[PDB]
């Protein structure tokens, strides 16, 4: 218990001018370290291993500070040993924390809240303990394997060079898929065969074997899985969706096929995934979830998938060759929930640093994916390189020429190397691009010909450079390292411009994803320039939820585009998240297997029967109401489902929760409520279908979101009219409506914030408390404030990824509205004017709470009766009966 007064040093990753880290341990209460960015922690080295008894912390003023304290005795694992989360003000006496004789050579103090400022500080920190005489071990540097040295390389080349081995692998893997999807007991009821393409097109066949088994042919694994899916949907009344609800009840005996079926697709590619999907949905996926997704992809005909798994190791090896240590690379790379905007060159650093063990684990996961994709015949889209470098690249490489890219939503964009330079100047685009493509091959090997990169995504700066020449040189460099390369390019709000695209000198080795074809198609300019392009349904923005789909456009515009074009080489999905409206994604991929328009109404009728395992006239009537309301074709511009007012920052005249969203309901709300009445009437009969319960919760929460918007307008009028008694009553029903909404959301495991957070905290094995807390920060921030203040507010990202989720609704959305309502009520009751609320401060307080110290959110759904909840909603919180209420 003696104060450690010699040999103590400290580091920090950021500080305001003159308030450096060493000022936290200089014995002077008048000097302080102060943070300058989102790295709000300091790391103290004790000059040896001590058994700590006390830690004492002083701040620079008398604000309320909250912080978490971590310790490490091996140099790698920092585990939580103390914290302050109460609302006590700091004072001249400091805060003393008792430590239970914990061994520690290093200490981390993370100050997550300063009630007075966005920036945090530590005036002094004193550590008390007993010297053990020991010193920390030297921590091993990051060590990763080359692909060619792993068993993955042996297996990948064996598949490549041995057709008999490759066919045995594929056919066995499709059999394993069957066991995973419907059960191992059904594996031996199928016989799978590889056949040739049908006149250059992927094709599958389904027929009777002759002895009661199902014979399925296909030119590759995807076609085989698609034929297996076709048999389930059309003969077993079965529907598979591992993310959004399934019906896997198989008949007691295998239904006979009857007449043989041969079905092909005219599309070379069926594409899946936005960069954003890797953040809003897949951030914390394990291999079990990736395997499910690839099974579902193959069954839906998907053969081209964006793949950024383990790209952090590729970039580490690359930047290591240009003066960057591993620690500097970790500061450049974002956290695990922000890779989408890191690789689209929009932001750096935030959410990190990643743990040291991240790099090898993710490279291994990526190799695991490529093995499975090779078995199925799914092409991954790896990374191209367009010149992205950190902002200090010139400091370490003096001859390099770079272009400042400015800001994106308050984040500092990375720099961009000049794609070409004058003669006499060093060309670091050529240097770094050569290293990048070579390092990518070292990590994963030759797994694809498709590479994605998107300079100037949603901003940037072309500097003095010529637009077309930029894309000419980027493509040529890509082809230099892979002669068969195809540059996969996003087409998003008119970018890249025609002048940029016309710089592509090899049109057949570029492929443009028309990102938003079902709302704002933009492929005519691509078709006119003879550029291969893909028709994509985006549908989902930020994971924001609500009933929303364009089935009629999918059933008609896709074959119409094929008939009116020559360079349409596929269809696909580009959702920012895969969590809502499974009908839309089922119908899209189904449109790959036809050249004619289909009837979206009769398609929906067949879809709901296999999704629920049964149907009747009333259930069909309810879904026709959905088709006539929430799923009805529209011709305006909109990003995602209409947002729930419950999820918006409280205020006057709200028209959306997110900056680029919308809350206008374009259908009649009371008409849509009829669908809920029908579902409730049929609840007892259909409650054995999990997909029915999924859909029931989906439309019931849409009902309460729609009615909450009306109740919000009424209490807004009551305030403007000075009617305090009416405001108290209407706002009381509004808050009660939200309480009912939280109960509805609690019935679905998909809607639990606890599952999102726990996945983040457990996505790596043998991680320390520090990494778990940081990953939880990633998970909490992304669905609320997104970034910190300058990103949420000035940057416009506040509640961009708002979710109608259990736990989050009770503790975040409800709390905001309750606070706002209480303020307005006090004013109407003859009090002082309602104060301004710093919403970000309140929101960031929830963001920084930890599951092991504050509140652990459940991972188990409730048993609430959706039919009974629907009755309450219709009787007490509905639009139809609103005047009686
Ligand atoms: C903050 C954010 O996620 N913004 C997304 C962006 O990341 C995405 O690349 C783009 C195309 O899907 N849509 C933007 C939203 O209009
Ligand atoms: Ca000091």
TrEMBL record:
Q: Which residues form the F5/8 type C domain?
A: 1-130
Q: Which residues bind N-acetyl-D-glucosamine?
A: 274, 280, 341, 344, 576
In this chain, Ca(2+) 1 is annotated as bound at 23, 26, 28, 31, 123-124
User: Domain of life of the organism in this record?
Assistant: Bacteria
What is the protein's name according to its record?
A: Alpha-N-acetylglucosaminidase family protein
Interval of the full protein contained in this chain: 26 to 910 of 2095
């Amino acid at each position: 218990g003696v104060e450690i007064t010699e040999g103590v040093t400290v580091t920090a990753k950021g500080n305001t001018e003159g308030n450096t880290a060493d000022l936290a341990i200089d014995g002077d209460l008048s000097t302080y370290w102060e943070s300058s960015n989102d790295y709000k922690w300091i790391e103290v080295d004790l000059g040896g291993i001590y058994e700590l008894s006390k830690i004492e912390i002083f701040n620079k003023d008398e604000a309320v500070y909250k912080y978490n304290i971590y310790a490490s005795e091996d140099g790698e694992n920092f585990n939580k040993i103390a914290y302050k989360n109460n609302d006590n003000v700091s004072d001249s006496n400091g805060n003393m924390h008792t430590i239970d004789n914990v061994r520690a050579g290093k200490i981390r103090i993370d100050v997550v809240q300063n009630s007075n400022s966005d920036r945090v500080n530590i005036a002094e920190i004193n550590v008390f303990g007993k010297n053990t005489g020991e010193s920390l071990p030297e921590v091993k540097k990051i060590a990763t394997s080359n692909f060619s040295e792993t068993p993955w390389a042996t297996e990948y080349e064996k598949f490549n060079s041995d057709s008999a081995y490759a066919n045995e692998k594929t056919l066995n893997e499709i059999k394993n898929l069957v066991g995973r999807v419907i059960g191992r007991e059904f594996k031996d009821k199928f016989i799978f065969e590889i056949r040739d393409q049908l006149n250059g097109n992927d094709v599958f066949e389904v027929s009777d074997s002759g002895d009661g088994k199902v014979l399925i042919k296909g030119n590759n694994g995807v076609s085989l899985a698609s034929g297996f899916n076709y048999y389930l949907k059309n003969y077993c009344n079965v529907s598979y969706n591992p993310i959004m609800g399934s019906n896997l009840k198989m008949p007691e005996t295998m239904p006979s096929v009857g007449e043989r079926v041969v079905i092909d697709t005219p599309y070379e590619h069926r594409y899946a995934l936005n960069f954003c999907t890797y953040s809003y949905t897949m951030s914390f996926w394990d291999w079990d979830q990736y395997e499910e997704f690839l099974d579902w992809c193959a069954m839906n005909g998907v053969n081209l998938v964006l793949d950024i798994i383990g790209q952090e190791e590729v970039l580490r090896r690359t930047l290591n060759e240009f003066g960057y240590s591993d620690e500097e690379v970790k500061e450049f790379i974002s956290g695990p929930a922000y890779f989408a905007w890191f690789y689209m060159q929009n932001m750096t650093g935030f959410g990190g640093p990643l743990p040291n063990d991240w790099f090898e684990q993710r490279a291994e996961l990526g190799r695991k994916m490529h093995d499975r994709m090779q078995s199925f015949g799914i092409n991954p889209v790896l990374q191209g390189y367009s010149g992205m470098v950190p902002r200090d690249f010139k400091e370490k490489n003096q001859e390099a020429q770079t272009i400042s890219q400015g800001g994106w939503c308050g984040f500092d964009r990375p720099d961009m190397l000049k794609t070409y330079v004058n003669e006499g100047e060093a060309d670091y685009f050529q240097k770094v691009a050569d290293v990048f493509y070579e390092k990518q091959k070292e990590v994963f090997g030759d797994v694809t010909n498709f590479y994605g990169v998107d300079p100037f995504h949603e901003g940037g700066n072309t500097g003095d450079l010529d637009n077309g020449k930029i894309y000419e040189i980027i493509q040529n460099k890509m082809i230099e390292h892979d002669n068969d390369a195809v540059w996969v390019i996003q087409n998003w709000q008119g970018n890249p411009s025609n002048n940029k695209l016309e710089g592509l000198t090899k049109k057949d080795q570029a492929m443009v994803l028309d990102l938003f074809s079902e709302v704002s198609p933009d492929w005519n300019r691509l078709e006119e320039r003879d550029l291969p392009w893909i028709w994509n349904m985006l549908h989902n923005f930020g994971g924001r939820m609500g009933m929303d789909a364009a089935p009629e456009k999918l059933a008609t515009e896709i074959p119409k585009a094929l008939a009116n074009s020559e360079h349409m080489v596929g269809i696909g999905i580009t959702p920012e998240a895969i969590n809502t409206n499974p009908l839309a994604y089922e119908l899209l991929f189904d449109m790959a297997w036809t050249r004619d328009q289909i009837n979206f109404r009769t398609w929906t009728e067949d879809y709901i029967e296999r999704r629920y395992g049964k149907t009747n006239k009333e259930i069909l009537e309810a879904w026709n109401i959905i088709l006539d309301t929430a799923y009805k074709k529209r011709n305006d511009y909109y990003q995602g489902a209409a947002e729930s007012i419950i999820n918006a920052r409280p205020g006057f005249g709200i028209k959306s929760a997110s900056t680029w969203g919308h809350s206008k309901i374009v259908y009649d709300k009371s008409e849509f409520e009829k669908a809920i009445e029908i579902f409730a009437k049929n609840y007892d009969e259909f409650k054995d279908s999990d997909a029915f319960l999924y859909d029931f919760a989906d439309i019931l929460k849409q009902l309460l979101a729609n009615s909450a918007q009306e109740y919000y307008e009424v209490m807004c009028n009551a305030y403007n009219n000075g009617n305090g008694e009416k405001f108290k009553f209407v706002s009381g029903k509004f808050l009660e409506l939200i309480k009912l909404q939280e109960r509805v959301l609690s019935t679905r495991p998909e809607f639990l914030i606890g599952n999102w957070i726990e996945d983040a905290r457990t996505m790596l094995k043998d991680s320390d408390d520090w990494t778990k807390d940081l990953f939880e920060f990633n998970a909490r921030a992304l669905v609320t404030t997104w970034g910190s203040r300058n990103n949420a507010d000035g940057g416009g990202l506040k509640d961009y990824s708002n979710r109608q989720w259990s736990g989050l609704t009770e503790d975040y959305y409800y709390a905001r509205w309750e606070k706002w309502i209480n303020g307005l009520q006090a004013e109407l009751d003859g009090g002082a004017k309602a104060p301004n609320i710093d919403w970000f401060k309140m929101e960031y307080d929830w963001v920084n709470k930890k599951s092991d110290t504050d509140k652990l959110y459940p991972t188990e759904a409730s048993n609430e009766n959706l039919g009974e909840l629907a009755k309450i909603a219709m009787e007490s919180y509905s639009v139809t009966n609103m005047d009686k209420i």
